[PDB]
Design a protein around this nucleic acid. Structure first.
Ligand SMILES: [Mg+2]
Lengths: 452, 286
DNA sequence: TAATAGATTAGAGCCGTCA
RNA sequence: UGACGGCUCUAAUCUAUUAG
């Protein structure tokens, strides 16, 4: 035991649902509790083929009825969107919109994809814009259905300019029955995922319709979490092109995203992954003011989260804008470095939440592992811990991992138990992906209902 | 009858925590974990830079050296003696030992040592390079076949050489459908958290166990096939058995770098244990 | 100006749907 | 483009380093 080393344990964070009560499992407690922000009715709109709408409505009237899972212990039941979320979602109320089949034959005829993708998106974007441009009956969220792959940033970026929430739906995910390979098996093989497939789309659709399924129930005041990620795009033929991103959450309401600038850095071939001091400090002042106005309170601590190490001069620019006691911590997470642990006795992998502290700055966090309540491990293989190291700034190490576990529960796209990485970075990946379709696209909305 | 009562969902919290959460939590008893980290129990007492001038050609391939050596500002990074490079290139006999600069391993590892012509971080990198390179020069003598991955150089055991195991019937080689699957490890070592050596687990596929499969799409696709049902014990044993097989002695692994001096890599992985953990033995089939 | 590497990164396919 | 993760396969780049 003398040479034995200790893994500290972080208590599982929890989230509070409607009526003020608090629970740990997001989807399990939600049915018993209800969404944090109830939404009265949801009506959507669909663009695509006639068979798409028939497939779309065939899915909608299916998910309202209770749907179970093959392994109900691993994936709990979904009694229905009307009961779980306390809302009402019909099919005949849904706004129906059509695209002529010959239009698909009109522009899919060209086998070239580089010219087709940008222009085929224009047909998708323009008709939706003409729909909710003067109609009194405004549609909450538009469900785009795609027949075949034969696109995300290309479509979302223009739609982003008009503050319209949309959710893309590949035809396979709703018609995997008929969709079969040469062996007759489904392309996506949705035999077991059924019961959980409805869970993630319903949470997504409810979120896009203005609802907030849950929020962190164990958050101290005065702190804010900011995620910065680096993305390089090949759309620009010029080698000097590498974008960045920045996210805010406010930890109590809808998130906030500010690009600051597209930022054509040096980028000798594709990028360097380092904010220049001019842009870095400019975004931070433009970042804190969002928290200052949202909570009408002076911020105290900001946890800048990234996947890369910060240099020295960028922190000096960072540190020269925060007033008084505002201290910045550089919590850079990395997934590459492996320290795969094995349970000596027994067959299950290391349970999640355990951490290995190598010093006062760096630590190994098992955001993925074995969770007892679900009686299963979310990591199919032996879990890979994420290296968490405090790149800059002085802060308690143990406090950092405590909130990272909490931050991994705030993923509204899917209703998973926890994310492998904190959502302050996972959402940032979806942030920079969308906005890089066109360089001149600006005036970006803060809401996270769209953008994903 | 007539269920008229305030809801008080906080009561439902108690039922939720005692009906479907019966003895299902994270704080029950102690546990011990076997890591993927293999400590380096002994380092060679000396790290030397050699001053081979006009004795090795500038166009010579240093990777062809009998012992792991690295060129560095017309100096040779190796633990081996200055006279262990006779067969690879002659004319090296005109070299005096006192010309070479000798650097102790203890300070170069603890970070104490630092000079003008070399720094700690680059010194740590060179040691990382040397022990990483020493594996290639050792796997030839250990009777295993290699395989180049995207970055690493994985090694596996040829089919039928052993009795499909090393100890306790731990299957290290086998076949699925008409293809053969073979457990393989990787090499990696670094010194910052502690002097230790990393290994990684990959399964290498061959059409019969000898004639490899060049189509990387088949190799990757088959890789996910075999691991989809592997247990945690399966990954633990197939790695422990593989390392134990590669070790030539029950003590540790001898990484020959010098004529007689070498590097000792403990076959027992660095050990971890936690104070409180899970309890669940439930399993039926899949 | 490309080689050798280590360290540190980002995309881009493919696969699995968890005891 | 319901997600997640865990894999291989590429791809920069930044550090000593020798030849330009
Ligand atoms: Mg989504």
């Amino acid at each position: 035991r003398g040479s034995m080393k200790e893994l500290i344990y972080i208590e599982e964070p929890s989230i509070l649902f409607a009526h003020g009560q608090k629970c740990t499992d997001p989807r399990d407690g939600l049915a018993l509790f209800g969404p944090l922000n109830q939404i009265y009715g949801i009506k959507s709109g669909v663009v695509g083929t006639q068979k798409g709408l028939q497939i779309f409505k065939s899915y909608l009237d299916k998910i309202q009825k209770p749907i179970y899972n093959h392994n109900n212990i691993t994936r709990p039941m979904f009694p229905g969107f009307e009961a779980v979320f306390g809302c009402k979602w019909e099919s005949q109320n849904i706004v129906f919109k059509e695209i002529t089949d010959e239009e698909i034959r009109r522009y899919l005829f060209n086998a070239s994809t580089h010219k087709r993708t940008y222009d085929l998106v224009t047909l998708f974007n323009d008709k939706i814009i003409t729909a909710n441009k003067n109609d009194e009956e405004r549609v909450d969220v538009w469900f785009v259905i795609v027949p075949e792959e034969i696109f995300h940033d290309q479509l979302k970026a223009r739609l982003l300019e008009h503050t319209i929430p949309t959710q893309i739906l590949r035809e396979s995910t709703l018609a995997w029955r008929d969709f079969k390979n040469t062996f007759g098996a489904p392309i996506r093989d949705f035999s077991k995922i059924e019961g959980h497939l409805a869970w993630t789309i319903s949470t997504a659709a409810y979120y896009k319709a203005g609802g907030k399924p849950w929020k962190l129930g164990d958050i101290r005041p005065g702190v804010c979490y900011l995620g910065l990620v680096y993305k390089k795009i090949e759309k620009s033929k010029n080698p000097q092109n590498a974008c960045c991103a920045a996210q805010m959450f406010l930890d109590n309401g809808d998130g906030t995203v500010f690009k600051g600038e597209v930022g054509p850095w040096y980028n000798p071939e594709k990028g360097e992954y380092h904010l220049k001091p001019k842009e870095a400090k400019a975004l931070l002042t433009q970042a804190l003011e969002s928290y200052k106005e949202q909570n009408k309170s002076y911020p105290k601590e900001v946890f800048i989260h990234a996947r890369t190490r910060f240099n020295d001069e960028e922190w000096n620019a960072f540190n020269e804008v925060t007033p008084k006691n505002t201290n910045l911590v550089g919590v850079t997470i990395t997934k590459s470095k492996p320290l795969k642990l094995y349970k000596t006795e027994g067959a299950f992998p290391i349970m999640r939440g355990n951490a290995y502290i190598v010093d006062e700055k760096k630590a190994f966090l098992w955001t993925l592992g074995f969770v007892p309540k679900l009686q299963s491990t979310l990591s199919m293989e032996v879990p890979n811990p994420i290296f968490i190291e405090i790149n800059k700034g002085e802060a308690e190490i143990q406090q950092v991992l405590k909130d990272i576990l909490a931050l991994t529960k705030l993923n509204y796209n899917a209703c998973i138990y926890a994310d492998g990485e904190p959502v302050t970075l996972r959402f940032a990946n979806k942030i920079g992906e969308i906005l890089t379709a066109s360089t001149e696209i600006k005036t970006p909305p803060l809401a996270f209902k769209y953008y994903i | 009858n007539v269920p008229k009562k305030p809801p008080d969902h906080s009561k439902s919290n108690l039922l939720y925590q005692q009906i479907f959460l019966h003895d299902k939590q994270a704080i029950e008893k102690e546990e011990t974990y076997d890591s993927n980290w293999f400590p380096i129990i002994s380092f060679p007492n000396e790290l030397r830079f050699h001053r081979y001038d006009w004795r090795l050609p500038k166009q010579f391939d240093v990777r062809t050296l009998a012992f792991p050596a690295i060129r560095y500002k017309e100096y040779l990074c190796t633990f081996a003696w200055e006279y262990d490079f006779i067969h690879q290139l002659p004319k090296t006999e005109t070299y005096n030992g006192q010309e070479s600069i000798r650097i102790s391993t203890s300070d170069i590892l603890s970070g104490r040592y630092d000079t003008d012509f070399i720094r700690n971080y680059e010194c740590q990198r060179l040691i990382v390079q040397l022990i990483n390179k020493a594996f290639e020069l050792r796997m030839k003598d250990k009777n295993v076949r290699e395989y180049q991955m995207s970055k690493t150089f994985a090694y596996w055991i040829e089919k039928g050489k052993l009795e499909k195991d090393k100890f306790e019937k731990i299957k290290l080689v086998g076949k699925q459908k008409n293809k053969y699957w073979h457990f393989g490890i990787s090499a990696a070592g670094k010194l910052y958290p502690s002097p230790v050596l990393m290994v990684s687990s990959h399964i290498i596929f061959t059409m019969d166990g000898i004639n490899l499969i060049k189509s990387k799409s088949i190799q990757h696709s088959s890789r996910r096939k075999q691991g989809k049902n592997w247990w945690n014990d399966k990954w633990r044993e197939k790695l422990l058995a593989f390392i134990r097989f590669l070790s030539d002695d029950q003590n540790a692994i001898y990484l020959n770098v010098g004529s007689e001096e070498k590097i000792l890599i403990s076959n027992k992985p660095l050990k971890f244990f936690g104070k409180m953990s899970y309890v669940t033995p439930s399993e039926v089939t899949l």
